[PDB]
């Protein structure tokens, strides 16, 4: 009777549902899965000792987007998202700054508190090399006396 109901329903769906290449020839629910990932991160981040320059953040749809002002025509803001939680001290992270930078943050991230340090250092260097990048242009341009 199964095949009778199949020919009643036009065709024989067990053939395509069982055959591979023959199957090769023959949205609101997904949105709610991203919001459930922030409830897990928000409690571990909520328990740990977040540094003072990182107390302000904006929980975005499936991520935590936190900012701190600098320069270079942008703001030092990053997006963070991960999965593990069982370890309270160390917290694996998956972040991005708003090809080498991606693997560098995926490299230093795969080891919570470390992220800032590295970033801080980087910013510092970029502020030095800001200075360097300015001094060069001062050494070439309006450099009257070099002594």
């Amino acid at each position: 009777l199964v095949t009778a109901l199949e020919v009643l329903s036009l065709g024989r769906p067990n053939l395509p549902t069982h055959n591979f290449k023959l199957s090769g020839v023959s949205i609101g629910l997904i949105l709610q899965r991203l919001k459930d990932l922030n409830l897990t991160v928000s409690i571990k981040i909520a328990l740990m000792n977040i540094p003072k320059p990182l107390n302000s953040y904006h929980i975005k749809n499936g991520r935590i987007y936190f900012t701190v002002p600098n320069e270079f025509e942008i703001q030092l803001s990053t997006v963070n998202r991960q999965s593990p939680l069982f370890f309270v001290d160390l917290k694996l992270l998956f972040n991005t700054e708003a090809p080498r930078l991606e693997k560098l943050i995926n490299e230093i991230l795969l080891k919570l508190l470390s992220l800032y340090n590295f970033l801080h250092k980087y910013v510092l260097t970029l502020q030095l090399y800001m200075v360097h990048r300015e001094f060069l242009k001062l050494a070439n341009g309006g450099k009257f006396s070099k002594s």
């Binding site: 009777l1 095949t3 009778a4 109901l5 009643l8």
Partner: peptide, 19 residues
């Protein structure tokens, strides 16, 4: 309807592929 399947599905048991 089931009445078509009780009288039509009986002829599907006797049938070799066509040659």
């Amino acid at each position: 309807n089931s009445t078509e399947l009780l009288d039509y599905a009986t002829k599907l048991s006797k049938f070799i592929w066509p040659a």
